[PDB]
Design an enzyme around this catalytic site. Sequence first.
Site, PDB file in Angstrom:
ATOM      1  N   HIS A  78       0.869  -1.220   0.000  1.00 24.89           N
ATOM      2  CA  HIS A  78       0.000   0.000   0.000  1.00 24.89           C
ATOM      3  C   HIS A  78       0.891   1.251   0.000  1.00 24.89           C
ATOM      4  O   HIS A  78       0.680   2.145  -0.841  1.00 24.89           O
ATOM      5  CB  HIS A  78      -1.040  -0.063   1.125  1.00 24.89           C
ATOM      6  N   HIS A 234      -9.026  -1.696  -5.315  1.00 26.26           N
ATOM      7  CA  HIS A 234      -7.997  -2.073  -4.309  1.00 26.26           C
ATOM      8  C   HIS A 234      -6.984  -3.044  -4.941  1.00 26.26           C
ATOM      9  O   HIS A 234      -5.757  -2.934  -4.658  1.00 26.26           O
ATOM     10  CB  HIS A 234      -8.598  -2.633  -3.019  1.00 26.26           C
ATOM     11  N   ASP A 238      -3.013  -2.414  -5.153  1.00 24.77           N
ATOM     12  CA  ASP A 238      -2.058  -3.500  -4.800  1.00 24.77           C
ATOM     13  C   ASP A 238      -1.047  -3.707  -5.933  1.00 24.77           C
ATOM     14  O   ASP A 238       0.165  -3.641  -5.634  1.00 24.77           O
ATOM     15  CB  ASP A 238      -2.751  -4.835  -4.528  1.00 24.77           C
ATOM     16  N   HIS A 261      -0.393 -11.174  -5.570  1.00 24.01           N
ATOM     17  CA  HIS A 261       1.041 -10.794  -5.463  1.00 24.01           C
ATOM     18  C   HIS A 261       1.959 -11.921  -5.962  1.00 24.01           C
ATOM     19  O   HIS A 261       3.009 -11.564  -6.522  1.00 24.01           O
ATOM     20  CB  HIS A 261       1.393 -10.244  -4.078  1.00 24.01           C
TER      21      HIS A 261
HETATM   22  C1  LIG Z   1     -13.791  -4.716  14.794  1.00 18.64           C
HETATM   23  O1  LIG Z   1     -13.966  -5.286  13.508  1.00 18.64           O
HETATM   24  C2  LIG Z   1     -14.315  -6.666  13.591  1.00 18.64           C
HETATM   25  C3  LIG Z   1     -13.836  -7.404  12.377  1.00 18.64           C
HETATM   26  C4  LIG Z   1     -13.754  -8.899  12.411  1.00 18.64           C
HETATM   27  C5  LIG Z   1     -12.501  -8.078  12.409  1.00 18.64           C
HETATM   28  C6  LIG Z   1     -11.665  -8.023  11.222  1.00 18.64           C
HETATM   29  C7  LIG Z   1     -10.876  -7.977  10.301  1.00 18.64           C
HETATM   30  C8  LIG Z   1      -9.950  -8.089   9.279  1.00 18.64           C
HETATM   31  C9  LIG Z   1      -9.275  -8.328   8.297  1.00 18.64           C
HETATM   32  C10 LIG Z   1      -8.632  -8.746   7.079  1.00 18.64           C
HETATM   33  C11 LIG Z   1      -8.814  -8.031   5.895  1.00 18.64           C
HETATM   34  C12 LIG Z   1      -8.238  -8.456   4.708  1.00 18.64           C
HETATM   35  C13 LIG Z   1      -7.463  -9.604   4.669  1.00 18.64           C
HETATM   36  C14 LIG Z   1      -6.847 -10.080   3.379  1.00 18.64           C
HETATM   37  O2  LIG Z   1      -5.796 -10.712   3.373  1.00 18.64           O
HETATM   38  N1  LIG Z   1      -7.514  -9.827   2.248  1.00 18.64           N
HETATM   39  C15 LIG Z   1      -7.103 -10.302   0.933  1.00 18.64           C
HETATM   40  C16 LIG Z   1      -8.104  -9.824  -0.114  1.00 18.64           C
HETATM   41  C17 LIG Z   1      -7.942  -8.346  -0.448  1.00 18.64           C
HETATM   42  C18 LIG Z   1      -6.906  -8.325  -1.552  1.00 18.64           C
HETATM   43  N2  LIG Z   1      -5.538  -8.319  -1.056  1.00 18.64           N
HETATM   44  C19 LIG Z   1      -4.970  -7.296  -0.408  1.00 18.64           C
HETATM   45  O3  LIG Z   1      -5.579  -6.320   0.034  1.00 18.64           O
HETATM   46  C20 LIG Z   1      -3.470  -7.452  -0.184  1.00 18.64           C
HETATM   47  C21 LIG Z   1      -3.197  -8.510   0.879  1.00 18.64           C
HETATM   48  C22 LIG Z   1      -3.483  -7.766   2.141  1.00 18.64           C
HETATM   49  F1  LIG Z   1      -4.854  -7.864   2.372  1.00 18.64           F
HETATM   50  C23 LIG Z   1      -3.086  -6.324   1.849  1.00 18.64           C
HETATM   51  N3  LIG Z   1      -2.823  -6.272   0.404  1.00 18.64           N
HETATM   52  C24 LIG Z   1      -7.236  -9.581  -2.392  1.00 18.64           C
HETATM   53  N4  LIG Z   1      -7.949 -10.456  -1.443  1.00 18.64           N
HETATM   54  C25 LIG Z   1      -8.486 -11.662  -1.722  1.00 18.64           C
HETATM   55  O4  LIG Z   1      -8.524 -12.058  -2.879  1.00 18.64           O
HETATM   56  C26 LIG Z   1      -9.001 -12.495  -0.625  1.00 18.64           C
HETATM   57  C27 LIG Z   1      -8.886 -13.990  -0.777  1.00 18.64           C
HETATM   58  C28 LIG Z   1     -10.206 -13.352  -0.906  1.00 18.64           C
HETATM   59  C29 LIG Z   1      -7.279 -10.326   5.842  1.00 18.64           C
HETATM   60  C30 LIG Z   1      -7.859  -9.911   7.029  1.00 18.64           C
HETATM   61 ZN   LIG Z   2      -4.067  -4.567  -0.567  1.00 15.27          ZN
END
Ligand SMILES: COC[C@@H]1C[C@H]1C#CC#Cc1ccc(C(=O)NC[C@H]2C[C@@H](NC(=O)[C@@H]3C[C@H](F)CN3)CN2C(=O)C2CC2)cc1
Ligand SMILES: [Zn+2]
Length: 290
Positions: A78, A234, A238, A261
């Site tokens: 980011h 997003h 990335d 990535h």
């Molecule tokens: C108080 O709030 C309560 C709520 C329950 C608490 C929470 C939370 C959280 C979290 C969280 C968010 C995102 C993620 C997470 O790893 N997301 C990955 C997402 C978004 C995007 N990659 C990116 O953005 C990359 C990797 C990193 F994410 C930052 N750069 C591609 N992608 C996908 O394809 C996923 C597989 C379906 C992993 C974890």
């Molecule tokens: Zn990201």
Amino acid sequence: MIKQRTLKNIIRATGVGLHSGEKVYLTLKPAPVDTGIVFSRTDLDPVVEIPARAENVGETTMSTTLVKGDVKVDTVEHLLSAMAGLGIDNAYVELSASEVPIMDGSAGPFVFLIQSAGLQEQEAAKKFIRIKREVSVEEGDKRAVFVPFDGFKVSFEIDFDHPVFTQQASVDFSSTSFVKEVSRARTFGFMRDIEYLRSQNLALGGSVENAIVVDENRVLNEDGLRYEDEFVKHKILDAIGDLYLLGNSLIGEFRGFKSGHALNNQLLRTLIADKDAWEVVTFEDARTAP
Ligand SMILES: COC[C@@H]1C[C@H]1C#CC#Cc1ccc(C(=O)NC[C@H]2C[C@@H](NC(=O)[C@@H]3C[C@H](F)CN3)CN2C(=O)C2CC2)cc1
Ligand SMILES: [Zn+2]
């Protein structure tokens, strides 16, 4: 001529690592001509610096990680995306822990901090990698491509079989603002994957403060989305972070199809390895440049 840029002034910020859940102190410092972007683990003695370059990417599949020895820096994409967006050639990024702060899940806070402290042009030509030949990588139903293009452009498409899903977007950054149209685009996670990753001592910093949280049907974040196409914007953000590991700004066009990535990294390595497909260029006249 088009000149290398660094920061005018140093900038300090605080946040939490998405995965580590650790409080992290971040310092961006100006840097000399031809330094590139250099990440620095200031908490270690002696201090460990990892150049933000494709050769230094670790085999971490949660986020974009730099490695040197058994020292890592997690989730660089980011910030790099924010420096790419503003055309920063030279900067030291100091961290007090293993992971970049997630802030609000987007590049907006980082783009604000950088422009807050201003840019300084330097007495050296900015070097560009110009795409000369199409370079394509695939694995299963995923694909990532460079195409020659007089400018800089990123097109992306995702295909989640989920009720919450435009899954396509195309931005020419010579015609459209990175800052307005992409920088505010936040990361996203499904409630079941987060629950799992929490069980594996991961996503320890995750919250609706720094992510779009999605259950089987809907966005749980009370205030909703920032763009109708926030998810695919997003993905673009990335990719722009990942591309900046070339250590030079790109003249050309990127296309992702369900890419991430790992395949993004395969495309950077395949490009660097095929010297017939790219050249480094400078521009004595900014007026005739793409
Ligand atoms: C108080 O709030 C309560 C709520 C329950 C608490 C929470 C939370 C959280 C979290 C969280 C968010 C995102 C993620 C997470 O790893 N997301 C990955 C997402 C978004 C995007 N990659 C990116 O953005 C990359 C990797 C990193 F994410 C930052 N750069 C591609 N992608 C996908 O394809 C996923 C597989 C379906 C992993 C974890
Ligand atoms: Zn990201």
